[PDB]
Amino acid sequence: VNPTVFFDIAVDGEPLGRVSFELFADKVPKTAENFRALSTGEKGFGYKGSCFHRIIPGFMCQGGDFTRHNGTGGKSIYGEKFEDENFILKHTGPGILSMANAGPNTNGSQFFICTAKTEWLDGKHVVFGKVKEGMNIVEAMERFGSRNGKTSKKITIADCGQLE
């Protein structure tokens, strides 16, 4: 069964709400597994406490740098950036979860949650999940972004994990 993970979002430390994701392990198991493991913290590092460093309303919310906490870091569970597993799934609309990268085969930990259809990213970024519940939290988050991407309040993953 495709795994479910959650983020508990906070805004300058004030809880906003829980966002739940389906991870498409049936299509991109290696990419799903990375994100699942980073969400549970089981390897002794991961997303908890990290922030969404770049939010552009009408485009996406980007996060996942738990190593430098400045948008320049992140790391996979595989000891090295990992391969683009496939581009079977497309950026079809709001709620898609996709990997940020530095060009082909450079997947780490950074990701984005789309707030619109982003079809120009098809074939460049690996789509691996989708918001299941709490898209309205992502819409609320999105309001703290700006056209240039800097956030006006600190948007954090206060807790995260895998759901039964």
Binding site: M60, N101, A102, G108, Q110
Partner: peptide, 13 residues
């Protein structure tokens, strides 16, 4: 060995 910063680009206009 130095690797690149993960990013995602806005649509080209």
């Amino acid at each position: 060995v130095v690797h690149g910063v993960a990013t995602v680009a806005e649509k080209t206009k």
